[PDB]
RNA sequence: UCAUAGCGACGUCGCUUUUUGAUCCUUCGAUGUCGGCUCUUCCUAUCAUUGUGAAGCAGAAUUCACCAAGCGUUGGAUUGUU
RNA sequence: CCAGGUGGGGAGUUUGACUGGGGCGGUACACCUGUCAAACGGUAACGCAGGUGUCCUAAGGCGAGCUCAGGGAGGACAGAAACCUCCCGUGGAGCAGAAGGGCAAAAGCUCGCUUGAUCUUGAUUUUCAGUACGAAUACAGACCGUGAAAGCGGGGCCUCACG
RNA sequence: GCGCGGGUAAACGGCGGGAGUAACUAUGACUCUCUUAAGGUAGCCAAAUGCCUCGUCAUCUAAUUAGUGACGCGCAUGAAU
RNA sequence: UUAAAUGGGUAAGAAGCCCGGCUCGCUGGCGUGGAGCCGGGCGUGGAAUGCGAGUGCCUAGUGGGCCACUUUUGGUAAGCA
RNA sequence: GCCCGGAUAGCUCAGCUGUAGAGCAUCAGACUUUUAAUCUGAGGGUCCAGGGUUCAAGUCCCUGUUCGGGCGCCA
RNA sequence: GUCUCCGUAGUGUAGGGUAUCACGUUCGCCUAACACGCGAAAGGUCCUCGGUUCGAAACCGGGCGGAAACA
RNA sequence: GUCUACGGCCAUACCACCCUGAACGCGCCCGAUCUCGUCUGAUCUCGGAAGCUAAGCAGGGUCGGGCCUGGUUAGUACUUGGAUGGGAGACCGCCUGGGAAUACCGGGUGCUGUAGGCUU
């Protein structure tokens, strides 16, 4: 029922989202988009690799399904249940149309649904231990034959999933200008009430 | 294909600017236009009454008649084929002068009395605009200071 | 719609603003004598079969309701008609509806 | 962590704001566009307003037209100086706004020079009376009354002003509607309540009947008339003169006074450095208090 | 129910009768208001079942309704608000908050409020 | 037991014109239209036969691959039938 | 001889169009909104999302007065919702309808009065070939309405509601 | 003349549906009802008439989508169509 | 919200500019305003580049198109639409 | 367009300018070996809506609402 | 393949404001006893899952099904 | 230096909280006989002047929130025109010119017309 994705692999439908117009549109596949620790707060995870596609493909929402089970299985076997935090950063908000077995009225019936990157555009991101990342490059490396497109792997230089560069991290939370929240961090400008400053640095 | 309404189209045109919904400005409306002055039509959409059609928003014209609450103006219309002259009545609101005509008049102004003063001063002096023409060969200084070498980046790959 | 059965408004004759009474227009019955009746009479008229052509469409659903109004004043009762937008329910006079009710029990 | 809150950053980014003037409520920017509003076809005929506006204290009248920069004053009138003359308590009432809109109309055919004609109404009376221009004279001023937000009802001292300009020689339109001789039920214009309270019987018989009522309620309502001795009666001819030296001079002049210092009364914005001190300041107490323990 | 129907009638009550119709209402009470019927912005009231005790004696027509009051408070000034011309807001401190409702209670009518519940 | 002797889910990249589609470019002053009978040659994505490799190939039997199309691939009942 | 009825026994003639061939199916056949449309305008497809053949003596015309959706805090019955009061509230409501635009002492709601939804000549815009219809915009001339007046109003806030 | 009223099917034609009901279950002799007025009776059948269909069972042959015999809720058999 | 590039309109003078002066039944506090008109003075001709323009009449054929870069709609795609 | 005929207990119809009735009904009582069957009662009029002639209307007259028919047909 | 309808006490059934009845089983009355009769009790998370609103078997989206109807 | 009436522009002006306010002024405040309204003088209207800046208002304050204006992002994203450029395509690079918007980090926070008052 569901076509060869080589005929769908390229964007070009003028992106075409889920709205009031697409109704009936089909539950996607993908509904769970991070695995792992989620409740690692900010350096017990402190390396991050991401995977990144250099195409402009529309990328479908099972694909991707079959890539983040075999990541967190990888994860899972090789590194522990524990070691690891799993975030997808595709959402298949594009839909696709099939029109079904002359072409009148040819606009057919959504049946899918895709996601569309470009050419800096990171798809995986795991943040880990530092003495992790050969085995992340492997998961990555084995993560990438469920994809149609052929995409590059890359160590992100900032520290996990953090905005902030790695080098400097320990350093910016000390000075305070940065503070620990759940998995993220809160940027701290000094430039609120002298309040907001003085309940915290003491 | 598409329905040929008054105001098709004139979704984003008609609506108001940003933070400037709300009552008119009165300022645009004791505006004093003559007949023969040079104005552009923009078509506020808060007043409904006498709106342009669509075609003309963002040209310009010249006033040909004055009422009540409107004005009539003259603006070339491009039919497919060729360009006419139009004559339509707008109210107020929906154009406002043009700077075109006035920044040239100020020109022209300061030309008169450029002729003026260089007669009996008895200097030849220059009246037209040229289009900005070479460049009047000059030197550079250097202060002993070493002009820095560049050199381009390396690639990196950040994201 | 709803009018009422009477209403001030200009009235040619007199030259001015008077009251009138309204009524439905309705349409007269054919002279039998006015000159396109005839000549549709002549030409129907011996062998042949129908010489004109039958309308049978009916495209329309409703007719544009026509108001006879006349000037009440004793020495001027001049009779204009005025033509109202189609309508599909329209009434003379009914009672004048006054949102503030119960609506209903 | 109950409720969502209303006045939250976007809100205020997108927020519109209104004119300065009405934010502080005082012009109705509808009713302003409909009065001020000249023709397009006159180009230059201002369409003068008579503004008139109630103070607590005091009476505003003054005659205006408005152009791109803002509105066109020529002259105004003012109950606090009215009492130069006349008058001197019983101020922002009827028989106040009648003589300052006389007194307004005055000063504004003197300051034309047109005075001499036009007198308008020199006998005060509540009727109806709506000045005509004479030919071969300059053509008789006709100004419409800038009501504001005041409520225009039956009976309001703007309408007050409104009669002083019209017996002044000012050709307002005005239907014969507003005024206190008028009767609703009954459609019917007195003409003669109406004097009484144009010239303030209205007030006169109210205070002479609070007599044999009260004193001391007598004395906390009319303190100012219990000075000055103002009598309900000899309160006839005493606006009586009021409106003959209104007919006799209504020019207004300042006084002059400019022994005065630039002694600022305000405080002035700080400069940047000076917020950089306080801030920086504050901090070092914070840290010294935190670090005394 | 239904709409536009004439569900309830009420009045608003201001000067001499409004306080010798609270102080009727609060010694109908005996002065006791217990825990939280004030209200955070300042002002308050309560409901009561039997109107006939006081004031008004039983008229056998008339029936059994009870009723609420909901008295307000205010200090002079408070109707720039609800002026006409240049309306504005009354300033913070120029406000009345639940706190001194209890406070001007005590101070007047010597009533009760907050028992230890 | 053991991912991969043999299999391959979730995905994904293709090949072919032996299905069926989509289009209507060629012919409507006509290219005889289903099937069968006969007859020739060609293709390999090899069913058998030659020679090989692998196995959960002890033998036998079988399965999976390679070079490989020279040769062979039947007789009948029912159905017009493919 | 004339009238009425019957009269495929018989006579003449018709039996739309667009269409990814036609037929069946739909109307892309007159229209309106948003998009397609590639930032003036114009722009196709049996492209998409929709709507129309009306409804309104007021849902029209004025003027005055009010602020709405929603939320918070309360207060007998009364609670998720009945009603009152206070507070916040850029409109997140309503304006007949589809949608878009526009709208806050408004164009929304409640009231007072009314018929400018009237009688006339031209001009212009809109599709346009710059024909017609329809619709619309400025005027000009009467006669009115409303308001205190400025003014506003010759139908519906504008974009369709028709020969 | 058409309507209104009778009569007429070896005249043209038509012979559907829903409820309730029997000691396994099932069905419903029986009772009621709807839409036009009845609701396929006697008989016959995968027929020259059955899409599903090469219906199923028996026989016929080594093998039978054929043939015969049998079953019939029969898309859509049937009484001088 | 912000907002390109590309792009659409207008102006770049003698029909202009400046002085006087008259007419008006429109407008009007006013010699108002506005329009119209008669005179007068202005020439370094008021950006580049190129080019001679303006105008009247009659009128055939055509009204099945297709393809190319780029933008783009439907469609899996198409020598598809 | 014309002539019209009928709308009333859940269903149909008679009808008093004068308190709507009959039935098929619904439910309940007696009645009964039980059921039938038999009666009785209660309750039930989308009196087609608006009017009007009216003391007084289901009726009489209009106005519409349908439902139905029988006639006439140049935009 | 597309489209339409429908998924509920054991079984089948109707049905936002706590699943009706029939049979199935138990059951207790009656009878000498059976039968019969009657009565009650038990009995279905209303196909599953996601959402929507105070709350959903109901409303809206899917997934399964089953059934036709076209193809 | 201000303030009042009328404004022009319509947040640099808004909103939140805090503090200061001399004189005029504006207000708050008192009363309901008349005008006028409502249920109620709450609003609206009218008549006053016992008291008060408390509120409004004005000024200032806030590492305030906004708003305005800058740097940044960045010659990046994008784009006019060209190639018998690369690449299977997807797209990318180059020539030619033009050229953005977040985040982040700075600065500012009402000017101004007329008319009229106060301020040694
Ligand atoms: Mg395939
Ligand atoms: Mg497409
Ligand atoms: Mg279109
Ligand atoms: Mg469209
Ligand atoms: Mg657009
Ligand atoms: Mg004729
Ligand atoms: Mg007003
Ligand atoms: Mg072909
Ligand atoms: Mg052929
Ligand atoms: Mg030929
Ligand atoms: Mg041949
Ligand atoms: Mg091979
Ligand atoms: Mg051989
Ligand atoms: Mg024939
Ligand atoms: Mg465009
Ligand atoms: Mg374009
Ligand atoms: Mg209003
Ligand atoms: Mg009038
Ligand atoms: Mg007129
Ligand atoms: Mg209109
Ligand atoms: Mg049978
Ligand atoms: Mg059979
Ligand atoms: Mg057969
Ligand atoms: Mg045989
Ligand atoms: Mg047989
Ligand atoms: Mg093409
Ligand atoms: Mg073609
Ligand atoms: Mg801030
Ligand atoms: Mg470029
Ligand atoms: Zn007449």
């Not at chain 4, 109309?105 to 007198?119: P, S, T, V, W």
């Not at chain 4, 006169?204 to 100012?224: P, V």
Request: aromatic residues 10%.
């Amino acid at each position: 029922g569901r076509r060869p994705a080589r005929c769908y692999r390229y964007c070009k439908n003028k992106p075409y989202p889920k709205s009031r117009f697409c109704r009936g549109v089909p539950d996607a596949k993908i509904r769970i988009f991070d695995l792992g620790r989620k409740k690692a707060k900010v350096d017990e995870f402190p390396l991050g690799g991401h995977m990144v596609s250099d195409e402009y493909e529309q990328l479908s929402s099972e694909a991707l399904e079959a890539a983040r089970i075999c990541a967190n299985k990888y994860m899972v076997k090789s590194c522990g249940r524990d070691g690891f935090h799993m975030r997808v950063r595709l959402h298949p908000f594009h839909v696709i149309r099939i029109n079904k077995m002359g072409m009148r009225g040819a606009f057919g019936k959504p049946q899918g649904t895709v996601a569309r990157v470009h050419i800096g555009q990171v798809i995986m991101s795991i943040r880990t231990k530092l003495q992790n990342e050969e085995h992340v490059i492997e998961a990555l490396r084995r993560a990438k034959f469920k994809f149609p497109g052929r995409q590059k792997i890359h160590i992100s230089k900032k520290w996990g999933f953090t905005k902030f560069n790695a080098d400097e991290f320990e350093d910016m939370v000390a000075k305070k200008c940065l503070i620990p929240d759940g998995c993220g961090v809160k940027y701290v400008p000094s430039h609120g009430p002298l309040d907001k400053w003085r309940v915290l640095h003491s | 294909t598409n329905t040929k309404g008054k105001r098709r189209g004139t979704r984003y045109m008609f609506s108001r600017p940003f933070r400037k919904h709300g009552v008119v400005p009165l300022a645009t409306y004791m505006r004093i236009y003559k007949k023969g002055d040079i104005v552009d039509i923009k078509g506020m959409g808060t007043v409904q009454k006498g709106m342009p059609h669509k075609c003309y928003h963002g040209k310009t014209g010249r006033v040909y008649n004055v009422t009540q609450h409107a004005v009539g103006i003259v603006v070339n219309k491009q039919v497919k084929g060729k360009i006419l002259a139009k004559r339509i009545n707008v109210r107020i609101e929906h154009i406002k002068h043009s700077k075109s005509r006035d920044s040239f008049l100020k020109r022209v102004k300061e030309n008169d009395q450029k002729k003026k003063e260089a007669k009996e001063k008895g200097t030849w002096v220059q009246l037209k605009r040229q289009p900005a023409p070479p460049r009047e060969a000059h030197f550079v200084r250097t202060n002993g200071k070493e002009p820095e070498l560049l050199e381009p980046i390396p690639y990196e790959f950040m994201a | 719609v709803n009018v009422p059965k009477t209403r001030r408004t200009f009235c040619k004759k007199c030259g001015k603003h008077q009251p009138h009474k309204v009524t439905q227009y309705k349409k007269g019955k054919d002279s039998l004598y006015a000159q396109g009746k005839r000549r549709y009479d002549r030409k129907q008229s011996g062998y042949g079969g129908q010489t004109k052509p039958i309308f049978r469409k009916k495209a329309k659903t409703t007719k544009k309701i026509v108001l006879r109004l006349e000037c009440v004043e004793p020495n001027c009762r001049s009779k204009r008609m005025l033509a109202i937008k189609r309508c599909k329910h329209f009434e003379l006079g009914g009672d004048k509806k006054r949102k503030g009710q119960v609506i209903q029990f | 962590g109950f409720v969502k809150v209303v006045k939250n950053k976007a809100y205020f980014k997108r927020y519109q704001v209104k004119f300065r003037r009405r934010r502080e409520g005082k012009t109705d920017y509808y009713a302003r566009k409909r009065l001020v509003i000249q023709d397009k076809n006159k180009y230059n005929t201002p369409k003068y307003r008579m503004i008139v506006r109630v103070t607590n204290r005091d009476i505003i009248c003054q005659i205006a037209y408005a152009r791109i920069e803002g509105d066109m004053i020529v002259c105004a009138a003012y109950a606090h100086e009215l009492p130069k003359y006349g008058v001197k308590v019983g101020l922002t009432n009827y028989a106040a706004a009648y003589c300052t809109g006389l007194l307004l109309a005055r000063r504004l055919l003197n300051r034309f020079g047109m005075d001499k004609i036009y007198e308008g109404q020199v006998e005060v009376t509540g009727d109806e009376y709506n000045v005509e221009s004479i030919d071969g004279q300059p053509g008789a001023f006709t100004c419409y009354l800038d009501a504001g937000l005041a409520r225009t009802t039956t009976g309001n001292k703007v309408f007050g002003a409104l009669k002083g300009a019209v017996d002044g020689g000012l050709s307002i339109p005005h239907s014969t509607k507003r005024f206190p001789g008028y009767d609703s039920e009954s459609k019917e214009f007195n003409a003669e309540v109406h004097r009484k309270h144009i010239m303030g019987q209205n007030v006169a018989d109210y205070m002479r009947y609070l007599m044999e009522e009260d004193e001391d309620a007598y004395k906390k309502q009319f303190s100012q008339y219990i000075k000055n001795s103002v009598t309900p009666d000899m309160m006839e001819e005493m606006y009586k003169k009021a409106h003959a030296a209104i007919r006799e001079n209504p020019v207004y002049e300042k006084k002059p006074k400019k022994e005065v210092k630039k002694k600022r009364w305000n405080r002035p914005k700080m400069s940047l450095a000076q917020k950089k001190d306080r801030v920086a300041q504050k901090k070092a107490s914070f840290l010294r208090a935190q670090e005394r323990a | 129910i239904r709409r536009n129907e004439k569900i309830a009638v009420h009045c608003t009550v201001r000067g001499a009768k409004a306080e010798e119709i609270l102080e009727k209402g609060l010694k109908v009470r005996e002065y006791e208001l217990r825990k939280n019927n004030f209200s955070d912005t300042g002002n308050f009231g309560f409901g009561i079942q039997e109107h006939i005790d006081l004031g008004i004696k039983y008229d056998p027509s008339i029936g059994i309704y009870g009723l609420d009051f909901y008295v307000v408070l205010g200090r002079p000034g408070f109707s720039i608000a609800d002026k006409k011309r240049r309306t504005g807001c009354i300033g913070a401190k120029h406000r009345i908050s639940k706190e001194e409702a209890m406070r001007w209670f005590q101070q007047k009518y010597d009533g009760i409020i907050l028992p230890g519940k």
